[PDB]
Design a binder for this molecule. Sequence first.
Ligand SMILES: CCCCCCCCCCO[C@@H]1O[C@H](CO)[C@@H](O[C@H]2O[C@H](CO)[C@@H](O)[C@H](O)[C@H]2O)[C@H](O)[C@H]1O
Ligand SMILES: CCCCCCCCCCO[C@@H]1O[C@H](CO)[C@@H](O[C@H]2O[C@H](CO)[C@@H](O)[C@H](O)[C@H]2O)[C@H](O)[C@H]1O
Ligand SMILES: CCCCCCCCCCO[C@@H]1O[C@H](CO)[C@@H](O[C@H]2O[C@H](CO)[C@@H](O)[C@H](O)[C@H]2O)[C@H](O)[C@H]1O
Ligand SMILES: [Br-]
Ligand SMILES: [Br-]
Ligand SMILES: [F-]
Ligand SMILES: [F-]
Ligand code: NA
Lengths: 125, 125, 96, 96
Amino acid sequence: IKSLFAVIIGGSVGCTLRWLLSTKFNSLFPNLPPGTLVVNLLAGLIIGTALAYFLRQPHLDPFWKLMITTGLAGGLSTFCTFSVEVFALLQAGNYIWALTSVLVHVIGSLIMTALGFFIITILFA
Amino acid sequence: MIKSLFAVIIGGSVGCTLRWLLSTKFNSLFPNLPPGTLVVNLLAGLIIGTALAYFLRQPHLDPFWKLMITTGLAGGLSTFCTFSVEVFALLQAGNYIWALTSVLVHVIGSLIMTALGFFIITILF
Amino acid sequence: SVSSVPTKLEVVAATPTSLLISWDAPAVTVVHYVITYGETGGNSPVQEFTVPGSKSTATISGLKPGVDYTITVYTMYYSYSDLYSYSSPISINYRT
Amino acid sequence: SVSSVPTKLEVVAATPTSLLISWDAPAVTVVHYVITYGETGGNSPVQEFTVPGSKSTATISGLKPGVDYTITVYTMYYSYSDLYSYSSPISINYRT
Ligand SMILES: CCCCCCCCCCO[C@@H]1O[C@H](CO)[C@@H](O[C@H]2O[C@H](CO)[C@@H](O)[C@H](O)[C@H]2O)[C@H](O)[C@H]1O
Ligand SMILES: CCCCCCCCCCO[C@@H]1O[C@H](CO)[C@@H](O[C@H]2O[C@H](CO)[C@@H](O)[C@H](O)[C@H]2O)[C@H](O)[C@H]1O
Ligand SMILES: CCCCCCCCCCO[C@@H]1O[C@H](CO)[C@@H](O[C@H]2O[C@H](CO)[C@@H](O)[C@H](O)[C@H]2O)[C@H](O)[C@H]1O
Ligand SMILES: [Br-]
Ligand SMILES: [Br-]
Ligand SMILES: [F-]
Ligand SMILES: [F-]
Ligand code: NA
């Protein structure tokens, strides 16, 4: 039950941010909506830092690990919104930005995950 | 902006809880490509796919339900950060063949579930 | 808050029985445009056809000489808040 | 309920100063194994080193002949619930 509250409190703040960031920014560049991208890059960053930091704190309450990762970063990022944007571009014959949106999201989120991981890795060393 | 805020929170919480329940039950069954994270992305792609064709034919729906299903449920159900660490962890484990296969199945599978949901409802109507 | 309606709908070239219309794309992901045309005097059926979202011009054929026609263009576009939806049309009158 | 601890840790080959160990990988994404070894007799410093998760064997060199050694191995694995964490160890004894 306490684990359930971690996902709800964390997921709500993640979804709220994604909603606010997407409505305010997605329309500024429809070929690659920057609000859906930032929340994914920002979630990959949080999950990367959490990956390295939690490894060095094995006695942290799983409550906090759960609220940040499964909740906050989970609700902040989105895969469905990333898909309709790509799907709509493919339907609009806009093939070059459908492919570009796939690379920037995937390559970017992984890079943001590595940055978050290696920055905490280096700071402790 | 307050009533719209409740739509994102309720849908996201249900979506985040579903992603949490399904992941802890099934991800461990096949670690090379955790099926729980894959299912919640395929399912969110299917939801956002059916909504793509159903919202198109119901232009007078309250923006409250459109917000609760897309930004809330599907958004909170799908994840891009959890899909990132799994790929990032496979890369650090030298498991490149599954790191690449995971990227393809998620991206292409999520677009197929978007197309399936969009075309099943387009054909029914 | 970005408008999904096309702008500057206009006949750029004309014959007595055909028209070349063009318009300016709106600042949204337009999946495809829809072009409607019919005789302005509301005593004629309206016809519609689609063009891909990458094209911003269209040809209307099979028309009658010296007749007033009402030509409208609206978009089937993707946005974040509304997913797929149809925009309001931009309309012009033209006499062949 | 999937164990991240390796199983069937054994010495498969040995020299007076070296030991080749092997284990069965656990059904989790292991990033790297941590192999520790020290003289079982009292207070000799335990020494450790890592092995990539793709390998399931490891060589231990620089030992003393005819000495009892305790060899433990644990993982630094990724799971959904703990992200990066360390597993409980599996341990064996061997005498060169
Ligand atoms: C990586 C794989 C992912 C999974 C598969 C995703 C598939 C998404 C696109 C499918 O939808 C179709 O796409 C066509 C191409 O965009 C459209 O053609 C439309 O636009 C074309 C533009 O050239 C015209 O030629 C066609 O006549 C016209 O129907 C068509 O309407 C649309 O239903
Ligand atoms: C295309 C988009 C790219 C986005 C960014 C991707 C970032 C990838 C980070 C990978 O992390 C490294 O992976 C190596 C390879 O797995 C590891 O080497 C470890 O594992 C290797 C493979 O077993 C061994 O050969 C090495 O000696 C050992 O240090 C290394 O520790 C680890 O930090
Ligand atoms: C787009 C960018 C793509 C490239 C990204 C960077 C990949 C190469 C990293 C080089 O530095 C690595 O740092 C690791 C630590 O972070 C070291 O791991 C060592 O220590 C780790 C634990 O910290 C173990 O898991 C490893 O097996 C062990 O080799 C590893 O030796 C060393 O080479
Ligand atoms: Br996560
Ligand atoms: Br969405
Ligand atoms: F999705
Ligand atoms: F991410
Ligand atoms: Na999400």
